[PDB]
């Protein structure tokens, strides 16, 4: 296995309640192994709304992210977040701007994997 699907749910700051941020990421994501390193690849819908995003492990280490696909037409963006096997969540901090309802906000949420990122290959 070079990769495997991994489902997740983005949940609200301070609880296990689903966050409506979950509605703007494709499901499942994917765990990808390259050489000795692991990536969580995920697709952001309504990419133009995500003005900033940072991901952290549960020990508050910022995780490197790369853009691997920007699709202007579909308004999506595919990103690779650096992870390790064993992570059960990521903390996200995002700056979201929604024109139609004049919204400009920063939020913190926690993305919860269906299970610990597995070792592969
Ligand atoms: C499609 C246009 C969107 C509309 C009309 C919308 C609307 C709203 C409204 C009215 C609230 C409650 C007030 C507030 O705290 O701001 C809210 C909360 C929130 N929104 Fe959005 N939103 C949109 C897109 C997004 C996107 C793309 C994200 C990022 C993935 C996002 C993430 C959040 C988060 C994290 C909250 C806090 C409550 C929760 O965690 O569910 N929203 N949104």
Swiss-Prot record:
Localization of this protein: Secreted, Cell wall
Identify the residues that the record assigns to the NEAT domain, covering every copy. 1-121
Uses, biotech or industry: A combined vaccine containing IsdA, IsdB, SdrD and SdrE afforded significant protection in mice against a lethal challenge with S.aureus Newman or any of the clinical isolates NRS252, N315, NRS248, USA100 and USA400. The immune response elicited by the combined vaccine is greater than the one elicited by its individual components.
Induction / repression: Repressed by fur in the presence of iron.
Residues the record lists as binding heme: 12, 19, 103
General function of this protein: Cell wall-anchored surface receptor that participates in the extraction of heme from oxidized methemoglobin/metHb to enable growth on hemoglobin as a sole iron source. Receives heme from IsdB and transfers it to IsdC. Also plays a role in the inhibition of host immune response. Protects S.aureus against the bactericidal protease activity of apolactoferrin. Decreases bacterial cellular hydrophobicity, which renders S.aureus resistant to bactericidal human skin fatty acids as well as to beta-defensins and cathelicidin.
Record note on domains: The NEAT domain is responsible for binding Fe(3+) and Fe(2+) heme and fibrinogen. The NEAT domain is an inhibitor of apolactoferrin activity, while the C-domain confers resistance to bovine lactoferricin.
Oligomer status and interactors: Monomer. Interacts with IsdC. Interacts with IsdB.
Can you tell me which family this protein belongs to?
Answer: Belongs to the IsdA family.
Specify the protein name: Iron-regulated surface determinant protein A
Naturally occurring in which organism (per UniProt): Staphylococcus aureus (strain N315)
Kindly list the organism's lineage: Bacteria, Bacillati, Bacillota, Bacilli, Bacillales
Q: Which residues of the full protein are shown?
A: 64 to 184 of 350
């Amino acid at each position: 296995a070079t990769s495997q699907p991994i489902n997740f749910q983005v949940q609200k700051d301070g609880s296990s309640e689903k966050s409506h941020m979950d509605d703007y990421m494709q499901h499942p994501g994917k765990v990808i192994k390259q050489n000795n390193k692991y990536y969580f690849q995920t697709v952001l819908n309504n990419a133009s709304f995500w003005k900033e995003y940072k991901f952290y492990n549960a020990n508050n280490q910022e995780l490197a992210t790369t853009v691997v696909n920007d699709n202007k037409k579909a308004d999506t963006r595919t990103i690779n977040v650096a992870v390790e096997p064993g992570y059960k969540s990521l903390t996200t901090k995002v700056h979201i701007v929604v024109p139609q309802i004049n919204a400009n906000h920063r939020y913190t949420t926690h993305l919860e994997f269906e299970k610990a990122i597995p070792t592969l290959a």
